[PDB]
Design a protein around this ligand. Structure first.
Ligand SMILES: O=C(NO)c1ccc2ccccc2n1
Ligand SMILES: O=C(NO)c1ccc2ccccc2n1
Lengths: 348, 348, 348, 348, 348
């Protein structure tokens, strides 16, 4: 018994769609959904999507409010659609997927993921919901997350963090670390060994190891000395070079966080979406050093040190592929006389 | 159990809101309501009102589909709101009234016209709906229409024509001539003696008397001779003068209809709404004679002849008040040497 | 080298997309595409679709400008998408299909219909384009049109008429009668025996048989006598009954055309789309007789006479299924004492 | 001599509508009002209301720039409209009331509050404006604020704080504490004894008593010991329980402010408007503990302690009504063995 | 080979327009430009301008990414248009100039500034781009910036700061201090001796002299004593008077910055654009002291002290003109008994 007024009733009374009966009066003006309170219109939702306002309002109300994988993980695993839920992409203020299964009559391609339309699509399944592990076993293509063991299925331990209502966190009162499973063409796929990005913010950056604590506290030369990083170009790659008009290196989020404590900078997110590697048009406010496309990855400093120290430094230019968030990230490694000149997530 | 999807279901299946149960998927984009049919969007409604699209869609679906008084009559009688119906104004593509009573949760000021909010408003009552004659008897302010006699109340015979789904017609299979009643502050009013406008179109004009048949079939001079209209300026007022840059007279719709058979002209409706007197910016295509504000009234030619022949012709300029469609219409009468120079429904 | 400016260049210079090189300056404001001519903006396209304005502009420019099957035929045959063309639905001012194959980067699900994404979809193939008869031979699901015989495939003779740039016509300078072929899961189907709707207009209705000429020229009683139609309720079904508030019958377009010559009426197309059976909210202007949902079919009068004369008239109410335009149309047949009371294309 | 260009002139030159003569060129595009400065358009106003852009621009320019009661107080007192002023609701970026009296020709229902249309509405009157105390005495329904004594009228001392240009403050250079008066149906109403919410922010929370200073400084167990709060469930109600997936208690703003100093959290304001009790969909970032509907009230901790300590703790579940901001707030009190389990502002 | 898809390709791959070949699929919906990434739409640009969305997207992509003069300087120098670049006004989120020269086919009035259409306009030229010094010499009207000496041209040393991608900074890795040159009617104009505004923020205010360090650190009376400012009304003008309902003085940004450290205030920017003197509707949160039009200038405190100490204090009211950012700023100086009462940038 789906309706705009019923979705609005649930939003007003339950904070989201909760299957409750009831209707509140709604008015739609342009891309905004309002409801009357004390005789005046109160905004319930502003449509920032390319879907019609009432359709986007319903998908947002029907968003998954449990800790879910971050959209970058779902994308890296090739997820096309979710089974009977909406994964809301808070970085885009829009549904992470184009279509739905058993969610909304306007976006639904099927009511159940067992319908033949879903067979070619990689359907996301949530083992925490009854019957979804079985649906993944019956699905030709899919990604499954579970909180525990699935008999006979070899697991892949995912990242410690998950997104709960747009807040990325490592759960203490809830479980955020899932087992991951993927199927392509009816065959369970072995997920590769992977590093995970840490999903931290520049403003609220917290070190997650003794090496990261030492990077933020120690001066550049004493950190590079303590961790035997001479010849690995951390001065350029991690700390950043702000002496020329073109900003040098600065590809690790921890390096940007260290710089940010001393002086501010503009980070233009010209493709605003969740991704393992981010590209920013950066402008350093103190110096005026800038770079149109500065690729940044948030790896734990220990993980980045392990990656760079595991490379052969005998060639001028070389592509280094590293698995991060289940995707293969190409890095461009530049060496001279057995030392690193630069190492960065390869542009385009 | 009112909803956007239910209103749309009724529109798709019943041609209008008919209280049926059911829901069809809807999408709202800008000011248009669509529904999915065979996987593609089909337009159900385009909002031309100043109300939110979903609210206007519901009032339009809940429009009165019986022959109703023309909006110009309701306006002339001071009608503010209708009891448990929507009078749709097809000339404005919008609800004739701002608010509703027992129609839509967004526009309702009350569910029943007996609520104290309605007491100061002139509520429209339709005696053809059960209990509405009694609701008018108990209302402080209101206008009542009936098909027959009401005990104790003296009737006012309204116009022969009514609007059925935006088509103004004199009913043959349905009754369109109503008895009108009005109450101001609990007192049944004596509605004044009135002429009625004929509500005809220029393209499909039909004569409704032997005088009108003779006006259309005879030449100007033999019609004026046959009906003894010499000195009443019908050459200017009714036939129109297209010899100068400013178009002379042409204030009776029958005169425009006669001209239209010979040659076309642009009639710019700069205030598009139903009214007893209409104002057009007219441009005659044959001559280039034009007038920014040409007031036009559609009176039966016999009624116009009666009005003009009942005037004192001894003053240069004078305001002549005529009750038409229950409202007071001011006409400007210009005379010289005991003869009419011009006579026109007053502008501003 | 697809671009908005290049599509606009083709529209301005070729009247549609013609693969020409060149760019014209464009401005997009709301849902309208403009181009600068002599320093001022000239409207090229107004988006009436639910797609983004620039995407809809490109699909419209890339529309098929050859005579194509009417959208109602494509829909009845279960067509989902077209191979390397856009079938423009002129009744909806929108693409007939959601997605494209080798047409536009925004709507394309594939570049060639041989891609596995297309295998479950019923792809439309035009045998007049090189290689499309062979692509249909190798397709799992599809509909093929040809002007002549195809080796091995038994044809279904389609309707005489086709749509050329939104004008439905029986071709004299072009071929509009196609052979139809259909495959479901790799198996060539036997298309059923079918009647075809005539796709005529009310304003420009032309009789296509001696029976239709006699229906329009003769009086009701002498036509029913000449064709031995007594007891078949043509007075109600075809001619229409305008004596009561609810308009009786009037379900054949020829009957509406005959009425239209005498007096006008409002036909409200509340679901504006191409379909075998149309539903109108009709209001007769002469009488005020009206009907919320008046189902109308344009069948050749001889075909309708054949259908009604081939029914058992011994039951009160019964569903009569008739294959029309390759689809199953349910009619409601009402009889009393061995005579027809009513017969109408079923509503909802 | 009201005009869009005159309103814009006043905004540009006076910072708001100040009755000055003059006109500046304006352009309206979509929902934004611009003015030309140095040959380019500069945004003057973005319409976030459901009123037409030019109408909302005028009401915003004509907003009251003196300290006025917070919208939650006006709503709790049943205020429908203001006399000859606009109370701007800065939390909704819109007028607090639908209609106006003597403010704008598009929204005005009357020019003076003495017009009979205003009699049923509760009109807000401002004793600081000449003749408004007299207008309240003559009004059938109304709310009056004054800075002092009104002869014969029993006052209600309002909150210490008022809103000045959207900034809630306790005035030092201006008076913000008003006397309140209310009339219903021509009869002056006795306003009840009430507590007042403190109207504080989470980010800039300041303690307003020694108890509040001790709550923020002392550890949970030593505060509960110092103030003899054992058995009153402050650990759940005020401090909050973040150990389970569902966040426990956390209904006093001071508790959220204390938590916020240690770790951040998302507070989703799903009904964004000023109200005595607010509902938030909260997500704790440290733990992942969340609650769809977490009712929060900003009471002075001493006032909340007084309310909870004045309750009978001998029943399992009970509704406790407390007057706050002149409205009756229902609280749900849950007890077991003579001790509080929970106490919260009752949902829906 | 300009196109929307090519501009979008450059934005996605280069962070701005960089003349690269390539096309990405784009969708335009309302005022937003999107591109498809991982099957979903990602916002590339939101149009906040009065230009069409696709046109504004192109001008923003073609914005100057080198340090450029702040828009207030260009405006004060009478700049109408820029030669072959777009100066993006980040305070208005729009192009600083209406038209372009050799930038975009929709906004271009010419391809080269040597075209006769540009002769009456003051064209901005950038000496850092090849051939632009020559173009300024050949231009009838223009403003030129250079990093060094132009033979025969007398320079004007501009401000130390410039805007790089919307960040105002004094360059360390880039040059931000330019030589300025202006031509009116083919004649090189002598730019006047001028002070420069410091372009600082309230939130991140940094003192740029020992006097500014002492103003922020010392108490009001000891600063006025140390710098011999008795009788110059700094208590009113710079520190601000918050004791009355109307906020007194507070016209120097440093005074607002000092106040901001102690308590917050609302600064309503009612004409949001870059200008030498800014007007704010200020509301002090601590006291409730407010002012509709509070003119604020960010001068180095030493420069303001020099200006006020260089005035004759023997007249009641007097206009003091001071050249700041190349424009003449009128100040209103009020004196009594040889002492300053007030001194402020003259309103309107
Ligand atoms: O003829 C009528 N058309 O509406 C009419 C007249 C008088 C009535 C009195 C009571 C109830 C209904 C009535 N209806
Ligand atoms: O007559 C035709 N109209 O499309 C037709 C028939 C058979 C064909 C077989 C192969 C290629 C093209 C063909 N074309």
């Amino acid at each position: 018994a789906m309706s705009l007024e019923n979705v609005a009733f649930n939003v007003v009374n339950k904070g989201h769609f909760d299957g409750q009966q009831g209707e509140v009066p709604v008015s739609i003006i342009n891309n905004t959904v309002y409801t009357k309170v004390d005789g005046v219109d109160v905004e319930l939702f502003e449509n920032k999507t390319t879907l019609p306002v009432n359709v986007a309002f319903e998908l947002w109300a029907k968003r998954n409010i449990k800790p879910v994988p971050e959209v970058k993980i779902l994308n890296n695993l090739g997820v096309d659609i979710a089974a009977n839920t909406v994964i809301w992409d808070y970085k885009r203020d829009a549904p992470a997927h184009i279509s739905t299964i058993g969610v909304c009559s306007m976006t639904d391609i099927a009511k159940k993921p067992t319908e033949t339309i879903c067979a070619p699509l990689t359907v996301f399944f949530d083992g925490r919901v009854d019957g979804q592990v079985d649906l993944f076993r019956n699905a030709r293509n899919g990604v499954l997350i579970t909180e525990g063991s699935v008999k006979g299925l070899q697991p892949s331990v995912g990242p410690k963090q998950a997104s709960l209502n747009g807040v990325t966190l490592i759960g203490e009162a809830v479980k955020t670390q899932f087992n991951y499973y993927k199927k392509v063409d009816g065959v369970v796929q072995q997920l590769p060994e992977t590093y995970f990005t840490q999903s931290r913010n520049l403003q609220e950056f917290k070190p997650r190891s003794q090496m990261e604590i030492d990077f933020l506290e120690l001066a550049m030369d004493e950190f590079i000395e303590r961790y035997k990083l001479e010849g690995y170009a951390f001065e350029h790659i991690v700390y950043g070079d702000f002496s020329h008009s073109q900003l040098g290196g600065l590809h690790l989020l921890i390096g940007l966080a260290k710089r940010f404590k001393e002086s501010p900078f503009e980070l233009e997110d010209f493709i605003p979406m969740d991704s393992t590697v981010k590209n920013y048009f950066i402008t350093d406010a103190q110096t005026g050093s800038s770079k149109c496309v500065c690729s940044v990855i948030d790896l734990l400093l220990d993980d980045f040190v392990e990656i760079i120290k595991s490379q052969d430094l005998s060639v001028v230019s070389k592509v280094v592929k590293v698995t991060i968030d289940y995707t293969e990230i190409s890095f461009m490694l530049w060496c001279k006389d057995g030392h690193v000149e630069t190492f960065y997530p390869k542009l385009q």
